[PDB]
Homo-oligomer: A and B are copies of this chain.
Amino acid sequence: TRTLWTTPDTSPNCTIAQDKDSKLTLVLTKCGSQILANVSLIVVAGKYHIINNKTNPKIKSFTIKLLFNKNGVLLDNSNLGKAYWNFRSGNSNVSTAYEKAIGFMPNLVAYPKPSNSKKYARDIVYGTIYLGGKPDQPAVIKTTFNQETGCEYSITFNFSWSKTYENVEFETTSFTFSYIAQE
C-alpha cells in the first residue's frame, strides 16, 4: 500500500484519441508528505502514434487526465482506464479495486481548485522527455495538479512539442517529479 501504479508492462491502458491507443506507465510512491512520481508514455495506435507535422502542422499537443473523487478513487472520465490502476502486488496489481488512497492525492492547500482568487503556478511541474530516446527529439511534459472540474483531485499530463517532427513514433523516456500529499 505504499505504491499506486500501472503495472509496468506494455499492454495499452489509456485512451487519448481512440480506445486503448496508449500505455501510460505511472508509479506513485508515498514518501510521507511527498509523493514520488515516475512517468512515461507509449502511444501504440491512432492520431498520436506517428507524428508527422509536415502532413499535420497543428498536431502539436495532447492531454491525459487522471480525475479522482474524495476517496482518491479514479473516475471513469479519466483517460487512464480504471482496470489498470491499483496498489502494487509483486509485478502486478491487487485483484480487488482499492477503496481509499487520499494519502496519494495532491494537497488542496498547496494546489487549490480553480476559483475567483489568484491562481499560482506552483501547481505545475515542467519536464522534458525524449521521443524514441533520441537526444534531438525533445517534448515537454507539463503536469498540473487539481485544476480539473468534475472531481475532487486531479493530475493532468499535457504533452507538447515545438519542433517539426516527420514520422516520429510517440514513445518516451521517463521523468521523475514529486508533489505535496493531501495527508
Contact = CB atoms under 8 A, between A and B. Distances in A.
A164 B129 CA distance: 25
A52 interface: no
Contact of A34 (B36, B90, B132): B36
Highest count of chain B CB atoms <10 Å: which of A3, A27, A123: A27
B31 A29 contact: yes
Contact of A25 (B3, B7, B32, B110): B110
Contacts of A123: 174
A108 B123 CA distance: 33
B128 A126 contact: yes
Interface stretch (A62-70, A78-86, A175-183): A175-183
Nearest to A129: B126
B125 A135 contact: no
Contact of A130 (B120, B121, B160): B121
Nearest to A134: B121
Contact of A122 (B121, B174, B176, B177): B174
A60 B110 CA distance: 27
A34 B27 contact: yes
B31 A110 contact: no
B133 A121 contact: yes
14 contacts: A5-B33, A8-B180, A30-B32, A31-B31, A40-B121, A42-B122, A90-B183, A91-B109, A125-B173, A125-B174, A125-B176, A126-B130, A135-B160, A176-B177
